[PDB]
Amino acid sequence: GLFGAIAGFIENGWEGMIDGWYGFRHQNSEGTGQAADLKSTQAAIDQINGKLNRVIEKTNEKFHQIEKEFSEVEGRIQDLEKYVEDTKIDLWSYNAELLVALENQHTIDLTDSEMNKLFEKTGRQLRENAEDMGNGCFKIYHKCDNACIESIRNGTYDHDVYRDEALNNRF
Amino acid sequence: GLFGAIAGFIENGWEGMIDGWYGFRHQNSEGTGQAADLKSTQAAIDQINGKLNRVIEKTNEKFHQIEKEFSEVEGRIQDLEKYVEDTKIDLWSYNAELLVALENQHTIDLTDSEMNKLFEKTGRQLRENAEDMGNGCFKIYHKCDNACIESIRNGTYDHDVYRDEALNNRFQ
Amino acid sequence: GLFGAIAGFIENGWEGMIDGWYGFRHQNSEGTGQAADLKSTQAAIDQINGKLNRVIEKTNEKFHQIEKEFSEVEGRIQDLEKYVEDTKIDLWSYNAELLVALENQHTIDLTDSEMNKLFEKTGRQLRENAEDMGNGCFKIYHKCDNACIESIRNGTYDHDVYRDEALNNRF
Amino acid sequence: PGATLCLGHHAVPNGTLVKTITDDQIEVTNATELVQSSSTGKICNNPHRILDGIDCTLIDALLGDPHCDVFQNETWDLFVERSKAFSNCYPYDVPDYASLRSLVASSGTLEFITEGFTWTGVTQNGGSNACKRGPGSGFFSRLNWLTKSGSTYPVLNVTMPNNDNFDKLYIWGVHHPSTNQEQTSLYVQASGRVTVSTRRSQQTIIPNIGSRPWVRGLSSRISIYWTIVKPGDVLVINSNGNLIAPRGYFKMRTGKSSIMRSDAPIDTCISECITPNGSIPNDKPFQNVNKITYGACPKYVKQNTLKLATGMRNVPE
Amino acid sequence: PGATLCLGHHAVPNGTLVKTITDDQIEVTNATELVQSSSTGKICNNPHRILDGIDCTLIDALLGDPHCDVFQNETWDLFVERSKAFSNCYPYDVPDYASLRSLVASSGTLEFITEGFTWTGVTQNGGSNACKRGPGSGFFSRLNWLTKSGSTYPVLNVTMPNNDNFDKLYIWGVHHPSTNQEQTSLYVQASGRVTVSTRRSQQTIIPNIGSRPWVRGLSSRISIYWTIVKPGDVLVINSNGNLIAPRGYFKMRTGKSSIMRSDAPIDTCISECITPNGSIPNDKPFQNVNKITYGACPKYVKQNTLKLATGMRNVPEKQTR
Amino acid sequence: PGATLCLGHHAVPNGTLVKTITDDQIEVTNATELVQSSSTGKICNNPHRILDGIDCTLIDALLGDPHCDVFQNETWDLFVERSKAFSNCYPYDVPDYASLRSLVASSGTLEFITEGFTWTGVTQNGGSNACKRGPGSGFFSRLNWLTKSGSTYPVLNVTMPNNDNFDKLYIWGVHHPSTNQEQTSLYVQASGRVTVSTRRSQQTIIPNIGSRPWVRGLSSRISIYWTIVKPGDVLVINSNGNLIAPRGYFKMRTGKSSIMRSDAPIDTCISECITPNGSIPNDKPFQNVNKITYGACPKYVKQNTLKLATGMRNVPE
Ligand SMILES: CC(=O)N[C@@H]1[C@@H](O)[C@H](O[C@@H]2O[C@H](CO)[C@H](O)[C@H](O[C@@H]3O[C@H](CO)[C@@H](O[C@@H]4O[C@H](CO[C@]5(C(=O)O)C[C@H](O)[C@@H](NC(C)=O)[C@H]([C@H](O)[C@H](O)CO)O5)[C@H](O)[C@H](O)[C@H]4O)[C@H](O)[C@H]3NC(C)=O)[C@H]2O)[C@@H](CO)O[C@H]1O
Ligand SMILES: CC(=O)N[C@@H]1[C@@H](O)[C@H](O[C@@H]2O[C@H](CO)[C@H](O)[C@H](O[C@@H]3O[C@H](CO)[C@@H](O[C@@H]4O[C@H](CO[C@]5(C(=O)O)C[C@H](O)[C@@H](NC(C)=O)[C@H]([C@H](O)[C@H](O)CO)O5)[C@H](O)[C@H](O)[C@H]4O)[C@H](O)[C@H]3NC(C)=O)[C@H]2O)[C@@H](CO)O[C@H]1O
Ligand SMILES: *[C@@H]1O[C@H](CO)[C@@H](O[C@@H]2O[C@H](CO)[C@@H](O[C@@H]3O[C@H](CO)[C@@H](O)[C@H](O[C@H]4O[C@H](CO)[C@@H](O)[C@H](O)[C@@H]4O)[C@@H]3O)[C@H](O)[C@H]2NC(C)=O)[C@H](O)[C@H]1NC(C)=O
Ligand SMILES: *[C@@H]1O[C@H](CO)[C@@H](O[C@@H]2O[C@H](CO)[C@@H](O[C@@H]3O[C@H](CO[C@H]4O[C@H](CO)[C@@H](O)[C@H](O)[C@@H]4O)[C@@H](O)[C@H](O)[C@@H]3O)[C@H](O)[C@H]2NC(C)=O)[C@H](O)[C@H]1NC(C)=O
Ligand SMILES: CC(=O)N[C@@H]1[C@@H](O)[C@H](O[C@@H]2O[C@H](CO[C@]3(C(=O)O)C[C@H](O)[C@@H](NC(C)=O)[C@H]([C@H](O)[C@H](O)CO)O3)[C@H](O)[C@H](O)[C@H]2O)[C@@H](CO)O[C@H]1O
Ligand SMILES: *[C@@H]1O[C@H](CO)[C@@H](O[C@@H]2O[C@H](CO)[C@@H](O[C@@H]3O[C@H](CO)[C@@H](O)[C@H](O)[C@@H]3O)[C@H](O)[C@H]2NC(C)=O)[C@H](O)[C@H]1NC(C)=O
Ligand SMILES: *[C@@H]1O[C@H](CO)[C@@H](O[C@@H]2O[C@H](CO)[C@@H](O[C@@H]3O[C@H](CO)[C@@H](O)[C@H](O)[C@@H]3O)[C@H](O)[C@H]2NC(C)=O)[C@H](O)[C@H]1NC(C)=O
Ligand SMILES: *[C@@H]1O[C@H](CO)[C@@H](O[C@@H]2O[C@H](CO)[C@@H](O[C@@H]3O[C@H](CO)[C@@H](O)[C@H](O)[C@@H]3O)[C@H](O)[C@H]2NC(C)=O)[C@H](O)[C@H]1NC(C)=O
Ligand SMILES: *[C@@H]1O[C@H](CO)[C@@H](O[C@@H]2O[C@H](CO)[C@@H](O)[C@H](O)[C@H]2NC(C)=O)[C@H](O)[C@H]1NC(C)=O
Ligand SMILES: *[C@@H]1O[C@H](CO)[C@@H](O[C@@H]2O[C@H](CO)[C@@H](O)[C@H](O)[C@H]2NC(C)=O)[C@H](O)[C@H]1NC(C)=O
Ligand SMILES: *[C@@H]1O[C@H](CO)[C@@H](O[C@@H]2O[C@H](CO)[C@@H](O)[C@H](O)[C@H]2NC(C)=O)[C@H](O)[C@H]1NC(C)=O
Ligand SMILES: *[C@@H]1O[C@H](CO)[C@@H](O)[C@H](O)[C@H]1NC(C)=O
Ligand SMILES: *[C@@H]1O[C@H](CO)[C@@H](O)[C@H](O)[C@H]1NC(C)=O
Ligand SMILES: *[C@@H]1O[C@H](CO)[C@@H](O)[C@H](O)[C@H]1NC(C)=O
Ligand SMILES: *[C@@H]1O[C@H](CO)[C@@H](O)[C@H](O)[C@H]1NC(C)=O
Ligand SMILES: *[C@@H]1O[C@H](CO)[C@@H](O)[C@H](O)[C@H]1NC(C)=O
């Protein structure tokens, strides 16, 4: 994707994350754990549902039209009826092919984007207490218990509380 | 949008910024102030003007065509004439609907992008003298008067001049 | 472009890089050098091959159709035959104009993206041993000979080896 | 000591392939089908009024072929013509059959109003053993076969004004004898003529005498014609032989009615969209079942499948 | 100590909702309308040459209905037919009326060149009280009603070669009497015949005697036909009764000319695009006024409005009110 | 003493301008052309079977104009009609010529099967000096000009059933004399009539006697008609003068065959796509050469050029 996260600096997905599309895995003094991020999951879900509902926005209604199958050879008028119908079908098939291609490139790029937004959001939260390892993981330079991990995930992490402890470990 | 700035880590727009699309607000020892950024404003405006003029790239010209309303019932030939036109109208209506949706998604993404470019450009300028607060605001770890703020906005900010002062405030 | 690298914070292209689309230039104690980055080049190249092969996904096949030039005036049936064809041609002409506009916008953005991805990847690699100068160049705060430069380019750069030396030069 | 915090995204062990601008095949975690490619094989009898022609074409029901008499009081949104239908009355052709079939299908009714045409000096209600009714010879119910009375066939000249506020459809015909002997025996004059006119237009038919292939015992034929009379207009019929006269008119409507050729059975269910293969759901925007449709239908495309990605790129572990 | 530097973007008090790929309605700071949905109700008389038909259809002007004499030799880019038009000459039909109307409308001219046809042994210039010209009986100006001279109507065999380098359009007809008395009284022969032919084509029409609905005093009719003669071809007319003869040919052209049904008045203004509702501006790419158009026009679509975003996303500051 | 590491991209000295969503002209490092706008000027004789009509229209080869005799039983994927073509037989017209030309062109064959029609009491093989075969007078090879035998022309009434499993195409005609002397001299009866019918269709043509403009010495004419007979159906021909009889039928096929008007010469090469200008390559998706095409062809568009970017934005040093 355009943003280089999914199938990028994040090496692969987590087949074990079944309760959300994006999330966190951590290792600290208390062990390891996994948790999904609801907000990013919703942003991707919401946008994909939006485009899905625009695409399946209900169908046109047609009644009496032209004949499209013929049991006898007729020449000029029938040549035109078939050509009109064949022309219409080719233009709609092209539209369907292009629509799906554009939509699908965009769906991959927007989901890549939402992964990247969560990663940048997390790093800005951590300020000078962490460093980007390059694989989607942060090294957190201070003791971060399970409560401290939850504080990062639910957006209430006060970086100043650990800044002194973290700065001396970094430098 | 794809970049997460407008309606993202920037909480809202400024109704009081009436002279530009993107800009700066600051607080220092001399008070508060606001200034629009012309380059980012211009970059987004040029692109929107560009796509607007491509869309209205003037119209086709048609003269004698087929009839499209009929005062008598005729059957096969009139069925075909109506079907041809109804087919054309449906395909053009589809084209118009897809065009505005694609254009508008892209316009929201490109204006989002210019906000992000200006934000990243500013942060690179500040180097090790500032820290990103996460809401589009930088905390600047040194005394920065109006001249110093203006120097950031017009691209003439020499980070080396304040680097020592700012590094000691950052690390303790 | 959307990412602000090509024709953005990178001031211009390198006409002298003939062995790749993206690459590195360095200056150190041993002089200057240039090297193309194959992975980023190939990522953009693979993608452009993909869309090129979709667009050249070969043509439809038509045989007997309607007549499209006429030597006599006939009125109603010929009015319709001409209108059917002129309607078709305008719709395909529109499809072609839109196709290249979308394709080319996307090609500029995806190549801009790959430039940005390489720049971000490098900065993550350098960790606390370098600073972004704002023009696509990193100032490297430690002795980095040719062996050290190639190690950055081929992904084997151990940041911890230079971290103490680099932190002391930065601060 | 400290901690590690990794950001990530989900995956599934085996995704689904979609197409993009750059890839014919790229694997995502989920997708949904945009092309309806199957039918139940049955035409649902709701919400549209379905009329099964069974053994009858619409034209044979219109003319009043005796085995199609059951359709006289009928209306439809969709008339369904079966490949087993057959004609079983006087042998006939319709120049511009397709237009007559189309304008009747679109009107959606066979409602017939009898008018008192006065046919002075001719015998009415001719019949044939090629069009049996009960034990005897018979004819199309809506047509009136006129022949000589005594030894003369006068010039017929009748008029019928349209003083209603709806269009009238008149169905009429011309009899083409197989020999000169039957021509003069039926119509006295050696050459017939049928002129049917309104204020602004007219149709003139000359009968054709000659031998044709045997159909239900006969080498002769009837050709069927039609005339629409708008409110305030007037019908005039003028003939000195071979007229197959209308008995009245069909009331025309405008609306959503149509006709379809199909052998799919009719079932008790609800479906907005009908194809000759049967009803199809219309939740998807496209369909590959049949370019012939009726109702609120997905658009017909050539692809049998098109996948819309509903998830991210699938990067399995 | 220190300082704060906040990056931001503008917002406006009154945004507009637009459609995108992911949202049917999301708010941006500004947008612009892509569908032209109004007309003035008037057809601009420039830059196209507009010819108001007034009381006359194009066909009645072509044949030369007397109250349409004012249209002789007229030209147009757009002939405008009004719903008040009426016929006031011999009752007639044109088999394939729509094609004759279309090919004349497209040709854009009624320029008529009289030719010296020699009609030996017949009376010319027949007229009717159903087609008054001045106080007396008359006829379509461009047609020549031939009847018997003395007691005979000979087999007519006349020729008119095309020695010019342009195509000739010939309008001719066949007369359908209401009674056998009329047929023999006008044409001697009990059954007429009109054959008009060129080197590669021929048309033969046999008249039918009988009553049609009473129109302007007549139960009889005239049927109108046409023949195009290319350079190097020759028109031949063969008839032994019931011929309604041409007096010459209409010059044919190719160009931008057409015809439109409309009751909109014609005004002095400038507009490239014309609809039956009146002229419309063509600055927008689409329009919902009428699928019938003439000129440099926006494409007709079904939507009555389509907003193209011309600004960023409008994110107002949330309020406690 | 540190080091500098600059990330960058290539540029070329002279890029090419392309169009985007926001720019009608912007410079990239490379692009490729999507509109085919040139032709070789020649029609390649592979892989499609090209049949050069030379001096003959398809219709003249069908009827059997003597200088078109070489086209007997020919087949084609694309019949090429040349502007130099001429007719050199009896002067004729085909009502709905365009439909006859189209349905034969699409069938792709002139395969003709002679059938044993018996024409009792008439003379066969009439000819004209306007249609010479060798030094003597002659006629269309596939038609049989019948005239009186001795002093009589009886009513012809003949039958030919279709007992095969394919459709038969019958070509027949009506002769229009220039004078009454020709009419009675050739057919005795003062007025002819031609009725050709199947079970489902019938056509009756009355000849028109009179002078038409001189063509190849003749003011008389023949009018050409056709009748298709499906399996199990029967052809009946009924006439008391002026019949131009068929000698058999043409076999009909369905397939990829067509016809094209072109003066491009035929060359020995391989090309899928054919226009009247000549063959064109089909590697590009669009073309601006001709809206008339045959084969696997790029779609016709109005633009003469459309550049697809194959490289990044070009930012020279
Ligand atoms: C004193 C005097 O001269 N009076 C006149 C009467 O004679 C005359 O009646 C007719 O007289 C002649 C002899 O002069 C003859 O007897 C007529 O009888 C016909 O006979 C032929 C020979 O067998 C017979 O032909 C067969 O017909 C069938 C088809 O038949 C029907 C049908 O079912 O289609 C019978 C229908 O009643 C008839 N309908 C009508 C309205 O006429 C139709 C119809 O005529 C045809 O469909 C037209 O195409 O035909 C088949 O064709 C066989 O191959 C064939 O052998 C006829 O069926 C006999 N006709 C009748 C009516 O029975 C006799 O009628 C009288 C009227 O002409 O006038 C007096 O002045
Ligand atoms: C010595 C000798 O024999 N001389 C010959 C003349 O007799 C002969 O003239 C004709 O003779 C008969 C009797 O022999 C009769 O007198 C004819 O007079 C007609 O009379 C009827 C009844 O009054 C009348 O019919 C009415 O017509 C109107 C409308 O008619 C017009 C019209 O306005 O359309 C009048 C036009 O002049 C006329 N134009 C032409 C070119 O003929 C047309 C035209 O006839 C029709 O439109 C064709 O369809 O008709 C209305 O239809 C009423 O309902 C109807 O009763 C006719 O109008 C009288 N005829 C005329 C010409 O006025 C008389 O013609 C002469 C020619 O045959 O030859 C001598 O040698
Ligand atoms: C074949 O049948 C039709 C219908 O029966 C018949 O046509 C009819 O002819 C009468 C004349 O007898 C027409 O009556 C006219 O009606 C108009 C109104 O639209 C009146 O203006 C006319 O009145 C004036 O003219 C009369 C001349 O006879 C005077 O007597 C009268 O006092 C007035 O001055 C006139 O009465 C009628 O309109 C038509 N009907 C239709 C439907 O056309 C036709 O004549 C018959 N043909 C034959 C050969 O018998
Ligand atoms: C002009 O020629 C026509 C062709 O010869 C004549 O028509 C023929 O007329 C006879 C009697 O007049 C008919 O004989 C009848 O035939 C049926 C059988 O019908 C069908 O059955 C087989 C199936 O096995 C089918 O394949 C055939 O095509 C038959 O059509 C018999 O059962 C009856 O007894 C009856 O005698 C012919 O059927 C009929 N043929 C055609 C093709 O119309 C016509 O009479 C001649 N005209 C004149 C004026 O002489
Ligand atoms: C039988 C014959 O040759 N009789 C002489 C007439 O031909 C000749 O009149 C001239 O005839 C010219 C056309 O003649 C042919 C033709 O088309 O070449 C001759 C054919 O034998 C004849 N074929 C048949 C089957 O009858 C054919 C046919 O009658 C017509 O084409 C039917 O329309 O005509 C041409 O018309 C000249 O204009 C004409 O003068 C006369 C007098 O010269 O002498 C006859 O002996
Ligand atoms: C936001 O977009 C709207 C368009 O929807 C802009 O409104 C348009 O503003 C222009 C100003 O140049 C108006 O054009 C002028 O019209 C007058 C006559 O009305 C004419 O004399 C001038 O020469 C010029 O053409 C235009 O009418 C107007 N459109 C509407 C629908 O109001 C608006 O200006 C945009 N706002 C911003 C801040 O960009
Ligand atoms: C009806 O009138 C037309 C025209 O007057 C007559 O047709 C003409 O017939 C003559 C026959 O002598 C044709 O002349 C021929 O011309 C060639 C050269 O073109 C000459 O070499 C021959 O010797 C011969 O004389 C003339 O072309 C032809 N005109 C047209 C336009 O075809 C016709 O005969 C008349 N018919 C009746 C029944 O009155
Ligand atoms: C392939 O063949 C077609 C048709 O044979 C060519 O189209 C023709 O192109 C010429 C000029 O390119 C047109 O000439 C016209 O001349 C008049 C008078 O000067 C002028 O008013 C027109 O604007 C035009 O230039 C000709 O009409 C046109 N014919 C058709 C049917 O479109 C086509 O150019 C050929 N393409 C190649 C690549 O050879
Ligand atoms: C894959 O995507 C489709 C489309 O979003 C999901 O199908 C929807 O499922 C919900 C129930 O979970 C239904 O209410 C909707 O009607 C379905 N939509 C369509 C278009 O069918 C599907 O559940 C997704 N699968 C997974 C594993 O996430
Ligand atoms: C729906 O019916 C149509 C028409 O019968 C089917 O199309 C035919 O399919 C057969 C078998 O594949 C082909 O031999 C014919 O050439 C097809 N005819 C036409 C006109 O396309 C179609 O396959 C059916 N589809 C479904 C899903 O039932
Ligand atoms: C332009 O004129 C057309 C008709 O010529 C208008 O559309 C019709 O509006 C009437 C209103 O009673 C409807 O009954 C018809 O069904 C409409 N016809 C069609 C073809 O849609 C149209 O609204 C006019 N537009 C403007 C802007 O005046
Ligand atoms: C990477 O660079 C180092 C030093 O520049 C070199 O010795 C080595 O061979 C390169 N490749 C790998 C896989 O280490
Ligand atoms: C049509 O309706 C009438 C009276 O309403 C009824 O008597 C007649 O039987 C009906 N016909 C059919 C075919 O049902
Ligand atoms: C029409 O034009 C022709 C040729 O220009 C001319 O001879 C004729 O007199 C004109 N007629 C009128 C009524 O102006
Ligand atoms: C453009 O197309 C191909 C590269 O894919 C190559 O043949 C050609 O030299 C390229 N031109 C430039 C200027 O890069
Ligand atoms: C034409 O058709 C068949 C061969 O398909 C054969 O009976 C006949 O002789 C063929 N004639 C020629 C000239 O090929």
The Cα A122–Cα D7 span in angstroms is 9
Discontinuities in chain B with C to N beyond 2.5 Å fall right after: none
Count of CB atoms situated within 10 Å of the CB of B122 = 22
Which residues are within 8 A (CB) of C86 and not within 5 positions of it... i.e. 6 or more apart? none
Q: What CATH number does the domain containing D108 carry?
A: 3.90.209.20
Tell me which residue has tokens 């990847």.
C121
Phi first, then psi: give them for residue D198, nearest 5 degrees: -120, -170
The Cα C14–Cα C3 span in angstroms is 19
Phi first, then psi: give them for residue D2, nearest 5 degrees: -160, -145
Beta strands in chain A (DSSP E): 22-28, 31-36, 61-62, 130-132, 137-140
Whole-number Å distance, alpha carbon F216 to ligand 7 midpoint, is: 12
Which residues are within 8 A (CB) of C90 and not within 5 positions of it... i.e. 6 or more apart? B60, F302
Checking DSSP bridges between strand F35-36 and strand E295-296, what pairing results, if any?
unpaired
Count of CB atoms situated within 10 Å of the CB of E233 = 18
Nearest CA to ligand 15 atom 10: F30
D-chain CB neighbours of C106 within 8 Å are 21
**Helix axis angle, B76-126 relative to C76-126, nearest 10°?**
20
Nearest to C127 by CA among C115, C111, C108, C142: C142
- At A131, is the secondary structure helix, strand, or coil? strand
**Helix axis angle, A76-126 relative to C76-126, nearest 10°?**
20
The count of CB pairs under 8 A between chains C and F is: 229
Task: Decide: residue F143, CB within 10 A, 0-12 exposed, 13-18 middle, 19+ buried.
Answer: buried
In contact, F192 and F183? CB cutoff 8 Å: yes
Instruction: Measure in Å the smallest separation between the Cα of B57 and chain F Cα atoms.
Output: 10
Task: Give the number of the ligand closest to the Cα of residue E157.
Answer: 7
Phi first, then psi: give them for residue D153, nearest 5 degrees: -130, 100
The Cα D193–Cα D199 span in angstroms is 19
Q: In this complex, is the C-beta atom of F98 within 8 Å of any C-beta atom belonging to chain A?
A: yes
Architecture of the domain whose range is C1-171: Alpha-Beta Complex (3.90)
- At E175, is the secondary structure helix, strand, or coil? strand
The Cα D44–Cα D42 span in angstroms is 6
Residue C127, Ramachandran bin (φ over 0: left; ψ between -120 and 50: alpha; else beta): left
In contact, A145 and A26? CB cutoff 8 Å: no
Interface touch D22/C54, C-beta < 8 Å: yes
Which chain A residues in 26-65 lie under 8 Å from chain E, judged by CB atoms?
47-48, 50-51, 53-54
Instruction: Measure in Å the smallest separation between the Cα of D52 and chain E Cα atoms.
Output: 35
Q: Which two tokens stand for residue F57?
A: 């229209």
Indicate whether residue F15 lines ligand 5 (CB < 6 A).
no
User: Which method was it determined by?
Assistant: X-ray
The Cα F234–Cα D215 span in angstroms is 11
Interface touch E10/B169, C-beta < 8 Å: no
Checking DSSP bridges between strand D221-229 and strand D92-93, what pairing results, if any?
parallel
Whole-number Å distance, alpha carbon E204 to ligand 5 midpoint, is: 24
- Residue type at A166 in one-letter notation: A
Count of CB atoms situated within 10 Å of the CB of D308 = 24
In contact, D207 and D241? CB cutoff 8 Å: yes
In contact, B41 and B155? CB cutoff 8 Å: no
Count of CB atoms situated within 10 Å of the CB of E125 = 12
In contact, A130 and A166? CB cutoff 8 Å: yes
HSE at residue A56, side-chain half, CA atoms within 13 A, is 17
Chain centroid, CA E85 distance in Å: 13
E-chain CB neighbours of C79 within 8 Å are 102
Q: In residues, how long is chain A?
A: 171
In contact, B171 and C171? CB cutoff 8 Å: yes
Nearest to E301 by CA among C6, B9, B96, A148: B96
Nearest CA to ligand 8 atom 2: F277
Architecture of the domain whose range is B1-172: Alpha-Beta Complex (3.90)
Q: In this complex, is the C-beta atom of E2 within 8 Å of any C-beta atom belonging to chain B?
A: yes
Q: What is the DSSP-derived secondary structure letter of residue A58?
A: P
Which residues are within 8 A (CB) of A42 and not within 5 positions of it... i.e. 6 or more apart? none
Q: Which two tokens stand for residue E309?
A: 């975003």
Nearest to B75 by CA among F140, D227, E299: D227
Closest chain D residue to C45, measured at CA: D22
Which chains would you list as touching D if contact means 3+ CB atom pairs under 8 Å? A, B, C, E, F
Indicate whether residue C85 lines ligand 12 (CB < 6 A).
no
Q: What is the DSSP-derived secondary structure letter of residue A71?
A: S
The Cα E143–Cα E140 span in angstroms is 5
Which residues are within 8 A (CB) of A20 and not within 5 positions of it... i.e. 6 or more apart? A36, A37, A38, A41, D10
The count of CB pairs under 8 A between chains A and B is: 55
Interface touch B80/A64, C-beta < 8 Å: no
Instruction: Measure in Å the smallest separation between the Cα of A106 and chain C Cα atoms.
Output: 11
- Residue type at E89 in one-letter notation: C
Widest CA span in chain B: 92
Resolution in Å, one decimal, please.
2.2
The Cα E301–Cα A50 span in angstroms is 24
**DSSP for chain F?**
--EEEEEEEB--SS-EEE--SS-SSEEES-EEE-EE----SSEEEESS-EEE-TT--HHHHHHT-GGGGGGTT-B-SEEEE-TT----SS-EE-TTHHHHHHHHHHHTB--EEE-----TTEEEEE-EEEEEETTEEE--TTEEEEEEBTTB-PPEEEEEE--SSS-EEEEEEEEE-SSHHHHHHHHSSSS-EEEEE-SS-EEEE----S----BTTBS-EEEEEEEEE-TT-EEEEEEEE-EEEESEEEE---SS-EEEE--PPEEEEE-SEEETTEEE--SSSEE-S-S--BEE-PEE-S-S--EEE-S-B----
**DSSP for E83-109?**
TT----SS-EE-TTHHHHHHHHHHHTB
**DSSP for E233-284?**
-EEEEEEEE-EEEESEEEE---SS-EEEE--PPEEEEE-SEEETTEEE--SS
Interface touch E24/A47, C-beta < 8 Å: no
Tell me which residue has tokens 């459709």.
F167
The Cα E197–Cα D289 span in angstroms is 51
Preceding amide of D281 cis, omega within 30: no
In contact, E175 and E219? CB cutoff 8 Å: no
In DSSP terms, D251 is beta-bridged to D168
Task: Decide: residue D178, CB within 10 A, 0-12 exposed, 13-18 middle, 19+ buried.
Answer: middle
**DSSP for chain D?**
--EEEEEEEB--SS-EEE--SS-SSEEES-EEE-EE----SSEEEESS-EEE-TT--HHHHHHT-GGGGGGTT-B-SEEEE-TT----SS-EE-TTHHHHHHHHHHH-B--EEE-----TTEE----EEEEEETTEEE--TTEEE-EEBTTB---EEEEEE--SSS-EEEEEEEEE-SSHHHHHHHHSSSS-EEEEE-SS-EEEE----S----BTTBS-EEEEEEEEE-TT-EEEEEEEE-EEEESEEEEP--SS-EEEE--PPEEEEE-SEEETTEEE--SSSEE-S-S--BEE-PEE-S-S--EEE-S-B----
Ligand 9 site residues (CB inside 6 A) read: A 52; D 30, 32, 310
Helix or strand run (H / E) with residue B80: helix B76-126
Indicate whether residue F310 lines ligand 15 (CB < 6 A).
yes
Task: Decide: residue E129, CB within 10 A, 0-12 exposed, 13-18 middle, 19+ buried.
Answer: exposed
- At E49, is the secondary structure helix, strand, or coil? coil
Q: Which domain holds residue D183?
A: 49-264
In DSSP terms, D148 is beta-bridged to D122
